[PDB]
Amino acid sequence: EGLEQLEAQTNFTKRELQVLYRGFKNECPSGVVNEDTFKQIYAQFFPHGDASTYAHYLFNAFDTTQTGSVKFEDFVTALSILLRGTVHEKLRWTFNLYDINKDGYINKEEMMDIVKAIYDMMGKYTYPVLKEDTPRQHVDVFFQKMDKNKTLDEFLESCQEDDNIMRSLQLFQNVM
């Protein structure tokens, strides 16, 4: 709307809201953004590798109700609750991001694809020369950080039990 959408469905000032809307319309004149736009903006931001599946998961998180193309209201609401929201909102967003399907548990293959999406970007021009093994140690470290049994509440508690990730949450909560 923009008339009453000052704080009801967003967490930004009028100036920030209007400039974000103008920029989005400049990049999306139709007013609706699709998956390919996410692909190409994510490739333009990081011009050092392949940026396909992580952008796909990001859009799927943004694609609420599986519409296939999110409008401005939900997009700006997500940006607001992730950049100027509460901690539980960020954890909910990360939960939905890491929950590709709709089960109550997060299994091995989900972490496999997530770590592949994280590690494929640097390509073949990195000093440590990453291989398929490093995702395996990373997933093992994450899983031993997770509960031993084959939990979203446990992941939440582990997130709030370590200050390194909490100080890695206000990195952008303050700026922009």
Partner 1 sequence: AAGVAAWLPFARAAAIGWMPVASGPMPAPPRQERKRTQDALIVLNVSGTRFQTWQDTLERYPDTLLGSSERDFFYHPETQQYFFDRDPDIFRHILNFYRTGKLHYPRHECISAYDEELAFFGLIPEIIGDCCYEEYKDRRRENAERLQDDADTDTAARQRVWRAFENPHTSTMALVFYYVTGFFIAVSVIANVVETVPCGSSPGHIKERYAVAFFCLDTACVMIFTVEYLLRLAAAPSRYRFVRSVMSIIDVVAILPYYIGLVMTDNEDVSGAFVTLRVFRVFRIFKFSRHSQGLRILGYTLKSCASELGFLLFSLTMAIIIFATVMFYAEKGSSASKFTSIPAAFWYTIVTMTTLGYGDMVPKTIAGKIFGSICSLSGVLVIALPVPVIVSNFSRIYHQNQRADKRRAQKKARLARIRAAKSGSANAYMQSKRSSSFETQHHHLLHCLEKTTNHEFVD
Segment near partner 1 (CB under 8 A); pick from 63-71, 100-108, 160-168: 160-168
Q: From residue 141, give the alpha-carbon distance in Å to each of 10, 27, 121, 134.
A: 36, 40, 21, 11
Site string for partner 1, 83-122 (x = CB under 8 A): x------x--xx--x----------------xx--xx-xx
Q: Is 163 annotated as a binding residue?
A: no
Residue 143 interacts with partner 1 (CB under 8 A): yes or no: no
The pair of structure tokens assigned to 47 is: 């011009």
CB crowding 31-63: b at 16 or more within 10 Å, else e: eebebebbbeebbeeeeeeebeebbbbbbbbbb
Shortest distance, position 103 Cβ to partner 1, whole Å: 19
Residue 23 interacts with partner 1 (CB under 8 A): yes or no: yes
The pair of structure tokens assigned to 136 is: 């395996």
Residue 159 interacts with partner 1 (CB under 8 A): yes or no: yes
Shortest distance, position 130 Cβ to partner 1, whole Å: 5
- Rounded to 10 deg, the angle between the 108-119 and 133-145 helix axes is 130
Q: What is the DSSP letter of 12?
A: S
Shortest distance, position 163 Cβ to partner 1, whole Å: 11
Q: How many angstroms separate the CA atoms of 61 and 5, rounded?
A: 22
In the bound state with partner 1, the residue whose beta carbon lies nearer, of 26 and 144, is: 26
Shortest distance, position 139 Cβ to partner 1, whole Å: 9
Contact call for residues 108 and 139 (beta carbons, < 8 A) = yes
Other C-beta atoms closer than 10 Å to the C-beta of 123 total 11
Q: Kindly state the greatest CA–CA separation across the chain.
A: 53
| Known binding-site residue numbers | 99, 101, 103, 105, 110, 147, 149, 154
Which residues would be at the binding site for partner 1 (CB under 8 A)?
Answer: 1-3, 14-16, 18-27, 29-31, 41-42, 44-48, 54, 58, 78-79, 82-83, 90, 93-94, 97, 114-115, 118-119, 121-122, 125-128, 130, 138, 142, 155, 159, 164-165, 167-169, 171-172, 174-176
